[PDB]
């Protein structure tokens, strides 16, 4: 997958060691089909591809988080769009985390506080703010 050095992972994922939980991930659910299409895609991913996503993810926080500051609802145009923006970013970055799939991530993310703590490192409750943004976004699209 990532096949990076502790130093690259640091320059790329910051103070986050995903590799250590590589095989540990499947322990949680390890039953998805998407993950199969992703592994094929992440098979050769390099630090660049991985860093490209981080700088991209950082951007996601300021705007999302900034929305929170303004006190605007998550199902707001700006928020939901942000959600649709997240979708295409994580989808084209692994295989194509569809809308229905993108949602599965939203909530299954609130369950494990390990993700939250690592994700919320930017701000508490962000996970909830995104899920609703993604959920709503999926609704306006859903037939």
């Amino acid at each position: 997958g990532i096949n990076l050095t502790p130093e690259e992972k640091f320059e790329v994922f910051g103070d986050f060691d995903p590799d250590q939980y590589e095989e540990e991930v499947r322990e949680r659910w390890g039953n998805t089909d998407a993950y199969r299409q992703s592994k094929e895609k992440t098979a050769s991913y390099t630090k660049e591809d991985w860093q490209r996503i981080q700088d991209e993810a950082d951007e996601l926080t300021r705007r999302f988080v900034a929305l929170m500051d303004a006190g605007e609802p998550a199902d707001s145009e700006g928020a939901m769009d942000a959600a649709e923006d997240h979708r295409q970013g994580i989808a084209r970055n692994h295989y194509d985390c569809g809308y229905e799939m993108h949602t599965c991530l939203g909530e299954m993310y609130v369950s494990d506080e390990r993700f939250t703590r690592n994700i919320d490192a930017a701000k508490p409750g962000l996970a909830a703010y995104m899920r609703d943004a993604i959920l709503a976004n999926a609704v306006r699209h859903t037939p």
Partner: peptide
């Protein structure tokens, strides 16, 4: 899907 710890997935 796609990782266990911040953002990709499978469900």
């Amino acid at each position: 899907s796609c990782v266990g710890x911040a953002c990709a997935x499978x469900a």
